Amino acid sequence: GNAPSGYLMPAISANNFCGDFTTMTPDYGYLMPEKGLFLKMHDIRGAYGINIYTYVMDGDNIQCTPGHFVMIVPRGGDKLEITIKKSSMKNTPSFTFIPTPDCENSAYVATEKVAGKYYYLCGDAEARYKFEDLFEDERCAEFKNLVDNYGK
Ligand SMILES: [Ca+2]
Ligand SMILES: [Ca+2]
């Protein structure tokens, strides 16, 4: 009913690509219908930057509005630094994700470019596993609690 879903998020210059999406370096997405949140994660040398968007549906389209940004930075001795910032509406992109009816290898594509490219949402189990492992990591309570308590 409200099970969350994970996505790989390659960025491609064309908005109508259908082929092998794994030739591109992906970000990761996580849709949480139980909370009305969409998370987008970017990896920089093992540190994670996660945007928490709020979303609503517009028919089949997922409309995503910036919320907060969580940074998770590994440090010596298996420590993590977790920090949270409010995202700016002016400086963090919004997304509208629309279906890809003609491509079975993607679930959605963005309506607008970011840095010249379209992000796709490609359904993916491993992306889901990555988020769910991070939520439940004993060191990540600050992140889990932000998400669990969000808007509430
Ligand atoms: Ca599709
Ligand atoms: Ca097939």
mmCIF file of C-alpha atoms and ligand atoms in Angstrom, residues 18 99-108 121, ligand 1:
data_model
loop_
_atom_site.group_PDB
_atom_site.id
_atom_site.type_symbol
_atom_site.label_atom_id
_atom_site.label_comp_id
_atom_site.label_asym_id
_atom_site.label_seq_id
_atom_site.Cartn_x
_atom_site.Cartn_y
_atom_site.Cartn_z
ATOM 1 C CA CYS A 18 15.817 3.997 -23.289
ATOM 2 C CA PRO A 99 6.264 8.563 -16.316
ATOM 3 C CA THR A 100 8.176 6.989 -19.202
ATOM 4 C CA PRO A 101 5.426 4.995 -20.953
ATOM 5 C CA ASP A 102 7.675 3.908 -23.826
ATOM 6 C CA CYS A 103 10.572 2.596 -21.715
ATOM 7 C CA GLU A 104 10.367 -0.369 -19.350
ATOM 8 C CA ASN A 105 13.884 0.348 -18.002
ATOM 9 C CA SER A 106 12.880 3.597 -16.286
ATOM 10 C CA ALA A 107 9.936 4.591 -14.092
ATOM 11 C CA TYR A 108 10.127 8.403 -14.403
ATOM 12 C CA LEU A 121 14.123 7.322 -11.702
HETATM 13 CA CA CA B 1 8.613 3.407 -17.954
#
